[PDB]
Amino acid sequence: WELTILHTNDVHSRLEQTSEDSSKCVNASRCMGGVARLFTKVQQIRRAEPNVLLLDAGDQYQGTIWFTVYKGAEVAHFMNALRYDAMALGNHEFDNGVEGLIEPLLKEAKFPILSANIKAKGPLASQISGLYLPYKVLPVGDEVVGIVGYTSKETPFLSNPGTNLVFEDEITALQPEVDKLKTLNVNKIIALGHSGFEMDKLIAQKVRGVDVVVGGHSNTFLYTGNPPSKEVPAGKYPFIVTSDDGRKVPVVQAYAFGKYLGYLKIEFDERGNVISSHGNPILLNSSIPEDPSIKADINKWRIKLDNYQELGKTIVYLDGSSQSCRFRECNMGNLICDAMINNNLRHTDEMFWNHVSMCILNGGGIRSPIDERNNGTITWENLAAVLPFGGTFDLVQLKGSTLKKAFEHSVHRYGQSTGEFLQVGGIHVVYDLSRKPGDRVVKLDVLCTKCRVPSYDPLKMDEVYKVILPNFLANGGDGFQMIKDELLRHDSGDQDINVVSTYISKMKVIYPAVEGRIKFS
Amino acid sequence: WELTILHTNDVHSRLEQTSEDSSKCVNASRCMGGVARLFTKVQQIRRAEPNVLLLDAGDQYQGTIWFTVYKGAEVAHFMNALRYDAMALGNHEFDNGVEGLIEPLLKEAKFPILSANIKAKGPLASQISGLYLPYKVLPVGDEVVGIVGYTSKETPFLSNPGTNLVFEDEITALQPEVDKLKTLNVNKIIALGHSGFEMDKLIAQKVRGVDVVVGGHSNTFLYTGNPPSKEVPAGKYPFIVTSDDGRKVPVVQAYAFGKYLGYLKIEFDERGNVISSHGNPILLNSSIPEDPSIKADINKWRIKLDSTQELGKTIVYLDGSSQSCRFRECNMGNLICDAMINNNLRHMFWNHVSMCILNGGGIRSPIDERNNGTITWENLAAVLPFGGTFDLVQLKGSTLKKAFEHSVHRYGQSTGEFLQVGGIHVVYDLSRKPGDRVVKLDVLCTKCRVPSYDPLKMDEVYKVILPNFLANGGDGFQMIKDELLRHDSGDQDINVVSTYISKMKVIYPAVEGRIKFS
Numbered sequence A: 001w002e003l004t005i006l007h008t009n010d011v012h013s014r015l016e017q018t019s020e021d022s023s024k025c026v027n028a029s030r031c032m033g034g035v036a037r038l039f040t041k042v043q044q045i046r047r048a049e050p051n052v053l054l055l056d057a058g059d060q061y062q063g064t065i066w067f068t069v070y071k072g073a074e075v076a077h078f079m080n081a082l083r084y085d086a087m088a089l090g091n092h093e094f095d096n097g098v099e100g101l102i103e104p105l106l107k108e109a110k111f112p113i114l115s116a117n118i119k120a121k122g123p124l125a126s127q128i129s130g131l132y133l134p135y136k137v138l139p140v141g142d143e144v145v146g147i148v149g150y151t152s153k154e155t156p157f158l159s160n161p162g163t164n165l166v167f168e169d170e171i172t173a174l175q176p177e178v179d180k181l182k183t184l185n186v187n188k189i190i191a192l193g194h195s196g197f198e199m200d201k202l203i204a205q206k207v208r209g210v211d212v213v214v215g216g217h218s219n220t221f222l223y224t225g226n227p228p229s230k231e232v233p234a235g236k237y238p239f240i241v242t243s244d245d246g247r248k249v250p251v252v253q254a255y256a257f258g259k260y261l262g263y264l265k266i267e268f269d270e271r272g273n274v275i276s277s278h279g280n281p282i283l284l285n286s287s288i289p290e291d292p293s294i295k296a297d298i299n300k301w302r303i304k305l306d307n308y309q310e311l312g313k314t315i316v317y318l319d320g321s322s323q324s325c326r327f328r329e330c331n332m333g334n335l336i337c338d339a340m341i342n343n344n345l346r347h348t349d350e351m352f353w354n355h356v357s358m359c360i361l362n363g364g365g366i367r368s369p370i371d372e373r374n375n376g377t378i379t380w381e382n383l384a385a386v387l388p389f390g391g392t393f394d395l396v397q398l399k400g401s402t403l404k405k406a407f408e409h410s411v412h413r414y415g416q417s418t419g420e421f422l423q424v425g426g427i428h429v430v431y432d433l434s435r436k437p438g439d440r441v442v443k444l445d446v447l448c449t450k451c452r453v454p455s456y457d458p459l460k461m462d463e464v465y466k467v468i469l470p471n472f473l474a475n476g477g478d479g480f481q482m483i484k485d486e487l488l489r490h491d492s493g494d495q496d497i498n499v500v501s502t503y504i505s506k507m508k509v510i511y512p513a514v515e516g517r518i519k520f521s
Numbered sequence B: 001w002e003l004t005i006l007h008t009n010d011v012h013s014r015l016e017q018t019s020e021d022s023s024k025c026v027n028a029s030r031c032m033g034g035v036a037r038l039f040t041k042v043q044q045i046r047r048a049e050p051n052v053l054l055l056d057a058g059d060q061y062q063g064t065i066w067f068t069v070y071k072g073a074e075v076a077h078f079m080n081a082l083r084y085d086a087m088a089l090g091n092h093e094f095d096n097g098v099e100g101l102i103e104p105l106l107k108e109a110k111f112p113i114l115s116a117n118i119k120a121k122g123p124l125a126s127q128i129s130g131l132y133l134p135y136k137v138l139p140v141g142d143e144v145v146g147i148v149g150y151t152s153k154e155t156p157f158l159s160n161p162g163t164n165l166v167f168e169d170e171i172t173a174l175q176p177e178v179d180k181l182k183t184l185n186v187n188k189i190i191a192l193g194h195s196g197f198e199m200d201k202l203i204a205q206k207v208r209g210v211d212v213v214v215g216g217h218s219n220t221f222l223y224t225g226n227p228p229s230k231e232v233p234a235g236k237y238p239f240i241v242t243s244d245d246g247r248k249v250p251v252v253q254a255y256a257f258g259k260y261l262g263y264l265k266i267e268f269d270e271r272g273n274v275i276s277s278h279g280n281p282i283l284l285n286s287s288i289p290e291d292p293s294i295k296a297d298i299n300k301w302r303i304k305l306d307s308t309q310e311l312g313k314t315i316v317y318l319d320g321s322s323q324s325c326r327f328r329e330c331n332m333g334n335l336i337c338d339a340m341i342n343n344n345l346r347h348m349f350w351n352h353v354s355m356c357i358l359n360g361g362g363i364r365s366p367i368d369e370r371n372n373g374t375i376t377w378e379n380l381a382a383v384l385p386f387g388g389t390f391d392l393v394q395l396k397g398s399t400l401k402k403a404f405e406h407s408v409h410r411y412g413q414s415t416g417e418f419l420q421v422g423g424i425h426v427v428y429d430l431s432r433k434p435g436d437r438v439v440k441l442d443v444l445c446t447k448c449r450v451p452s453y454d455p456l457k458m459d460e461v462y463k464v465i466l467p468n469f470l471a472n473g474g475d476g477f478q479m480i481k482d483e484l485l486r487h488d489s490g491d492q493d494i495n496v497v498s499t500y501i502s503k504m505k506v507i508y509p510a511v512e513g514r515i516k517f518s
């Protein structure tokens, strides 16, 4: 008995086809992904194979004006049109609160939405009862397949799920559900979830009875053979984990932004044991036509969006890709920090903040690049994809020791494409990744403020510094608990996207460089 | 027989009293220099000492809107009022060409103007004949003293003297003039000139018959004891040179910008041999009152000068002092280079240009931030007085590396070649041999979607924005003039910086590490 698992993750509101790097489509012959093209490929496979599941591992929410405007209604609509079979909740599904998850998505989805490790408490429990499930048993041909869901333990620090939801440890929360399925004589079991590649492998190894893990969150690209595009494989597809109970468990993920369709064929015996698995993500390039009906529907909904005028011009590529901004100095990060600093200084009235020259900004907050080849034009739509969260750029007062700890946290688990990696302004930092976590920062110089000419001086642990940063970080987002607990003063500031669009309008032509604000030894 | 030598050099249009750093006076209680205050001090000395000479060692011209508007007439007028006894020509005296010097300095000065190593060729010769002299014999009491003048032979690459003036070696041109004075039995000789401290010491050493050297050009502060202000002494005052004759020859200079009055007392014997000398520059601070009469004349002329509206605000000290910009990265240089780049980018072969060089010698004043941050046209005019343009050139890598070597080839003499930059990270090792001091030179890539710094390559070609002065080989940058591959003239220098300050509204250039030393 063969099962074909088709899988997406971290689509992040890329409803329309995109440029190769997931930014707006311009030359529609090199464009990729989009829901209309996805439909075609799914349809082709459904024509060919008898036992097909189409799964999503979370993070449909957030990423373009589609989501800014339709708030998830577009998600339920097009996922329904694609006839997804199940979805696990990702952290970004909680970005508009539970209220923004229940109403546009949980009420409208025609397929089960899953997470076994999220527990409701207080009044919310009976409100959201049954709207998402820990698992679902799905008929596939004459067989059934159990699908069990999970969501990153870190979600309260990543998104806005509120205080009435408890996020338990994935493995602990999963094992009883998998056991219940086994007592129900479900012998084929897929764990579908949004915790990242490292947790996916742990689940494969530790949760007895799981046959396949379909993951997301870390935007992991896996591939067997020579890759068809710019993404560099982190490992083979599928990635085989040897479980503690001695089984070979395939672990898959499919990058992000709808660029690829995950495709894994599993051979089971009649008792539900995996005999073999093989596949590869399918590049959704222009060789696959966009489905006319879906496309027409897309064009219909695209009308309301067209509103989003030219803000200014860039003469350089604005690299706001996660592969850059979560790993090293990226010019989009520099631009945003420079904008934060610039906008604030143009408030010369407020005396306590009018020399602030230091900025930090989590790479996880930077959600898209902007391409320069379209006459360099930058529009509100382009920018809303970079900064979709509607946050503010705030001022805080911090001890040197706090900042040093923040920079340690920035790389404490480097290599997993997590969001806490810091972009900067008025700061020169050097990391040595070979040293133990907590001790990786080997140089940290900052612009002096009590000096008539700004220059770089070593940060002192017992001095106090003034820093501009996203409110998300001021509130301890991405696990910067030291900032929230230790800050000395916190004033709220201007709206993030307005700050950057203003700066671009003032500057007229921008050209941020990679300058060596951040180095590695 | 005791002679009192009072001396100024490199006043550079500081006619009005100034802030301590030579920029515009704001809080008059803490201000310094200016001709009114100088007059008071000179007068206190003349009234107390029998044998006084007041000498200037050049570079009166250029530095504030006084010179922009009056073009030298203010120099002749106020030097006449102070009754200078002699002046040597400096390089900046040629900024407005020979016509800018003949009229109105040489025609209107009531004192001799000197330079023995400047020779006029062709038709200019008869036109300039006698308007400046190689030497002058001055009666002082019952005695005479000879003064011989000299002017940096680098003047053609620093200023605009034209093709009809020849600038000979100072030492070779001085010796026969000094010999002529000996023939006339003048036994007390002062060399007064504008070539810098190093040349002044060479003159003291090798020109037989010179008793005292009074210099300028390098803005050298010399002092004996604890200095009265921020300037750090480069040596004792006077600086003693041992000549090739075995004689001790005092060498003096008095910083710049009219901040100090040089004061040297010298004891001569009957045969015009220096027995001893002592003194010190006198700090012209607020303990010395401005002469009411000179002040009133200054206040009268000042009317035609009233700048004006605020261009924008700075929240940082804009360090355009020579002690910074000719020695290390200074934030005024960063500001000007970033403005050069910014203006060009928003206003096509050059539309990606990200590299800038600017000689520190073109940066003529700082701007103080403590005046409610305000920046006026007057402030800016003091920083960029030359009316040049910011041009675009195309240069081989090898040329650029040569330029950066030249930049530090004689580091330490406060000369103008030292380069401020944009889009470039340079590292110097000053312990290495001249011509091999550049140990790291990274520049912003051009053929790239995202700008980053990469090592400069000799064989590659770069586009750079820089002053027309450098494109033309000013400051000895011959390699740029001779080797460049394309040169397009650009916008007016002060206009570029003004509009940038205006567009940015609030500025805050930092010292970032664009230039480092090993």
Ligand SMILES: *[C@@H]1O[C@H](CO)[C@@H](O)[C@H](O)[C@H]1NC(C)=O
Pocket (backbone or CB within 6 Å): A228, A283, A285, A286, A287
């Ligand atoms: C689509 O992907 C396949 C596999 O890499 C490739 O052979 C084909 O050329 C691609 N189509 C286009 C239009 O590039």
Ligand SMILES: *[C@@H]1O[C@H](CO)[C@@H](O)[C@H](O)[C@H]1NC(C)=O
Pocket (backbone or CB within 6 Å): B228, B283, B285, B286, B287
């Ligand atoms: C002026 O300078 C001298 C030291 O050179 C000092 O004694 C005097 O106090 C100064 N005057 C003022 C007003 O500071």
Ligand SMILES: [Zn+2]
Pocket (backbone or CB within 6 Å): A010, A012, A059, A092, A217
């Ligand atoms: Zn995601």
Ligand SMILES: [Zn+2]
Pocket (backbone or CB within 6 Å): A059, A090, A091, A092, A194, A216, A217, A218
């Ligand atoms: Zn996620």
Ligand SMILES: [Zn+2]
Pocket (backbone or CB within 6 Å): B010, B012, B059, B092, B217
């Ligand atoms: Zn000078």
Ligand SMILES: [Zn+2]
Pocket (backbone or CB within 6 Å): B059, B090, B091, B092, B194, B216, B217, B218
């Ligand atoms: Zn000079």
